[PDB]
Write a protein that binds this ligand. Sequence first.
Ligand SMILES: [Cl-]
Ligand code: NA
Lengths: 385, 391
Amino acid sequence: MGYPVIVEATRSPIGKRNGWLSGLHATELLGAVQKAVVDKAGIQSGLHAGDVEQVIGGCVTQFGEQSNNISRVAWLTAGLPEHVGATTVDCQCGSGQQANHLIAGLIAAGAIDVGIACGIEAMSRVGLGANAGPDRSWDIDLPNQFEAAERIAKRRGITREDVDVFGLESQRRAQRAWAEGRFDREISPIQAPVLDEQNQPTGERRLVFRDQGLRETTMAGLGELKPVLEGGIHTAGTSSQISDGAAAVLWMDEAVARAHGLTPRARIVAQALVGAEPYYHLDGPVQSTAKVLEKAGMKIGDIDIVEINEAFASVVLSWARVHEPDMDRVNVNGGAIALGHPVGCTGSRLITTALHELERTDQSLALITMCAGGALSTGTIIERI
Amino acid sequence: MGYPVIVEATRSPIGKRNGWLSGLHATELLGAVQKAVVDKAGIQSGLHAGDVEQVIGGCVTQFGEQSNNISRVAWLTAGLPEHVGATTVDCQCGSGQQANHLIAGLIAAGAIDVGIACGIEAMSRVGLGANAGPDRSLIRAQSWDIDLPNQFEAAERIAKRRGITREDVDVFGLESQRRAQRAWAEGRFDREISPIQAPVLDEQNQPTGERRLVFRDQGLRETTMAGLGELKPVLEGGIHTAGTSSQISDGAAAVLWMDEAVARAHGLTPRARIVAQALVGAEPYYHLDGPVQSTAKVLEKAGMKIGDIDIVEINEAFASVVLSWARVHEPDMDRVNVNGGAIALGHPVGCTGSRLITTALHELERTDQSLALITMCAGGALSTGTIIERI
Ligand SMILES: [Cl-]
Ligand code: NA
């Protein structure tokens, strides 16, 4: 029955831990962006939020503020129409991306005509590991994310100098894109309650629009940062930042889009959520890229733009030794090192970044790929329309 | 691209709060049930665990044991191949049903040729509320304008709306126990259950060190109108007692989906299709009357009336939820929950959705009838509907 297309995509700016956005309840953050993508969309023709049929939102730590189907709770918090169905999903770091895969699915099945995929992570309000806790006081364990980043690094001959060159360029490329206002179209600025040094609301609610994570960065400077692991090569200036943010993409059946005055903007050429190798934990992008290129019938050379998530520099460097891409087409507006990584959101964020960059530069094809806790990886290939 | 169809479906028996399955890590319970639905398909064909491309699982209380994407942890726990992708989902009480819906889309999209929708809840091990903290209304924001009651309160509001007495729900709760013992004593669940190896526990809840095969639903109990009438309402002034509402349970279910082309290519009979699917919103004041809307939505998507449907599975969260739904849609009640519902069989929340689809399928097949409706109320004022057809 259906053919899914993106008709609109938007994101909050990404705030730092305890930064510009720590004053929003996670449900508000998400809800705000849910309404923002519907509002952006509603301009060309009369689309209203009750035209939406289902919402599917990635979120990793589904505890407290982020428990109880946040995709549903945000929708309602934001005062949007209660008839609209909502599901929240978890496949760690890829949840945000997976949400788009799933919404596409539903349209393809002719189950819905209009859906919103989104993702959220208010890592200031609800932090990593808040969803377990008691846990104690053949058959072996996944490394933790910092151990994996070093394992991946040893596997590929990736050196401290290598990853510092990377983190520096991530910072540079983001600063340039900010300077040029390349983010301006994708960003819905957000009203946030301002907290103080004591963590209490002043009265003010600033209008946040800039990604908080940018920072003057130097080869010399990076240079003296401490590894996070004893004996490791990853520092803080070469691994993504903990952040707050939310993102949202609005999908339609192309014919319904076309019939009610909305312009289709992109389709999915191919999509995947694949397993990775437990030992390396986060090398998943090798696997997901391989699978979507394979399905698409394409080679890395056919892809104009790649968003691969800078969880850690080694991950990306490791994925580049395997698929041998042109580094000038990978993370062109910088990435998570510079801009931040609010885990549940990132996957919808990346799709959002890439679509706008294909639109800005008038190019055709983008690859989106992320590694993910529990040794998963998500990949997508989108084609501009 | 794809035309998605169920080739196999299986479920654990359902175990009581602290009961026959409480000895198992939530992950082990799903893990076993995931492994089992694959196993069943391999008996007819070459198909094995690594042919599955993705698993999607439902689970509501996504804390501790049930956290960090239990769908994946479970798969890995059962020793199944690591190359398979996995995601866990939450649309509350419908999660297990939506998981099915979602696998079907990924097939329809041509994303995958083979997938598993499953569901788990080990309420023995992880209980309602364990995913929020102490002050249970710091999960909203201090701008919550909507009147959304707790589930018990909701069942009583629906009850008042429809004029449902303490007699009616006690009449209802008895008939579920009666149908569930009749289905069981007839071995109606035999094809659908795959028996689960479980540790035995002592009068405390300590493992004796003996394994056992569990094969029956623990919740069947002797019930009489008298006995039902002596039970104390969950809420003061309420009509619902422990006898006319579902039981906190452990269980899991899983359904194996394939493209139709790939199915016949690999030797397997398609068993059923989705005719229509929905997840929709409910009136928040009533909270749990959603089945009324989802039944309406899927009935329309399909082009049918209630009267076209051979059997219904509507979840018995509360007697009044079902009676409210019947009083609005006017079904033939002998065709509703024909083998008993969650009052008698139990309600392992995240699993029930796949459980209802597995049960529903199996009754069509056992009766050579055509159409089934599965509908469920869910927390957050939601409701999943599915119309499946034997194919
Ligand atoms: Cl009945
Ligand atoms: Na649905």
